[PDB]
Every structure is written in structure tokens, then in C-alpha cells.
Design a protein around this ligand. Structure first.
Ligand SMILES: Nc1nc2c(ncn2[C@@H]2O[C@H](COP(=O)(O)OP(=O)(O)O)[C@@H](O)[C@H]2O)c(=O)[nH]1
Ligand SMILES: [Mg+2]
Length: 179
């Protein structure tokens, strides 16, 4: 297999760990783990190519003992995530994650990923955002942000329902394979 390294970044609680675990293990987790610490290397075939994809989960600022800069060397593709239930997590894409990723991983392809797509039509989510004069992120807003940051693509998924999960990793693998 062709070997590639994937790093996932984005705001705390936007669904990074659950996305990796659903992709890797095909089951939504029952216990809470801030960052996947088991070594996961996933086998995936795309366009008739066998690829081994190392999945590197990342910690928040508060985890000073496991700092994120150590994750960036030799990265082949980035998943840069926000949550569709959190317009705040989208605004951090240009203001925090893109400056960080492009600093440490110049010229590495980025897939922008909108997580928790199942919450777009969730009424608890709608009600809570409405009290803040907010609403769920629209797909067009994600695509616009993908243009702004020079992402290779924009994808939406739900780790909870599995919708779009495989496709995220397939797109990321295709990006990582580009010469
Ligand atoms: N509704 C919904 N909740 C999700 C989804 N993915 C994760 N969550 C929840 O969001 C919270 C944060 O998820 P986690 O993967 O730990 O986020 P991380 O901090 O980015 O690693 C947890 O309560 C998860 O159960 C999803 O696709 N849909
Ligand atoms: Mg996590």
C-alpha cells in the first residue's frame, strides 16, 4: 500500500474524534476520549490504489502535554473541521485554523469538513441557536469558506448517522495521492 498521513484539526467538540472512530471502527463511541491514542492506520482503496492512511487526532489548547505542533510534520492531507451546529466553529476556520495549518503545513491539501450534519434540522439545535440570533451553517457557507481558504474541497458528514463519512476520507485520500 501507498502510505499517507492525515491530520484532523478544528474547534473543541466539533466532532473530530468521533469522525475518526466512525471511519475506523464503523461504530459511534460510548466512552469519552479527547484524542484517539490508539495508533490507527486505516486501509482504504481509491481509484484502484491501495493506501494506508495514518489518522492523527489533535488536542485542544488546554492539552499542553500533547501539543499540536508535534502532529504536523510530514502531513499529506489535513481535515479541517467545524460543526454545522456551530457558526462560531466556522468563524474560527479563517481566524485560527487556516493560519495555524498553513504555517506548519504549507502546501498540504486541506479538506474543509462540516461535521454533525444531522443537527442542521434538529429542533433543539435550532432553538438554542435562535436564542443567540444564530442558525445552523448552510452548505453554501461551507463552500464559500472552502474558496476563501483555498481548500481542495468542502464535504459535509455526520459521524452519528454515518452520512458522508466514507466520502470525506475518500476525498482526503485522493488529495493526498496528488503528485
Ligand atoms: N449530533 C452529533 N453529535 C456528534 C457527532 N459527532 C460527534 N458528536 C458529539 O459531539 C461531542 C464532541 O465530539 P468529539 O468527537 O469528542 O469532538 P472533538 O472535541 O472535536 O474531538 C460529543 O458529545 C459527541 O458525541 C455527530 O455527527 N452528530
Ligand atoms: Mg477529540
Amino acid at each position: 500500500a501507498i502510505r499517507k498521513k492525515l491530520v484532523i484539526v478544528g474547534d473543541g467538540a466539533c466532532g473530530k474524534t468521533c469522525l475518526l472512530i466512525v471511519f475506523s471502527k464503523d461504530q459511534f463511541p460510548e466512552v469519552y476520549v479527547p484524542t484517539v491514542f490508539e495508533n490507527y492506520v486505516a486501509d482504504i482503496e481509491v481509484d484502484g490504489k491501495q493506501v494506508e492512511l495514518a489518522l492523527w487526532d489533535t488536542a485542544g489548547q488546554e492539552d499542553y502535554d500533547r501539543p499540536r505542533p508535534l502532529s504536523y510534520p510530514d502531513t499529506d492531507v489535513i481535515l479541517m473541521c467545524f460543526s454545522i451546529d456551530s457558526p462560531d466553529s466556522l468563524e474560527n476556520i479563517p481566524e485560527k485554523w487556516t493560519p495555524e495549518v498553513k504555517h506548519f503545513c504549507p502546501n498540504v491539501p486541506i479538506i474543509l469538513v462540516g461535521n454533525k450534519k444531522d443537527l442542521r434540522n434538529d429542533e433543539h439545535t435550532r432553538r438554542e441557536l435562535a436564542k443567540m440570533k444564530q442558525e445552523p451553517v448552510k452548505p453554501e457557507e461551507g463552500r464559500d469558506m472552502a474558496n476563501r481558504i483555498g481548500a481542495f474541497g468542502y464535504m459535509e458528514c455526520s459521524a452519528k448517522t454515518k452520512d458522508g463519512v466514507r466520502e470525506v476520507f475518500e476525498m482526503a485520500t485522493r488529495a493526498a495521492l496528488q503528485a
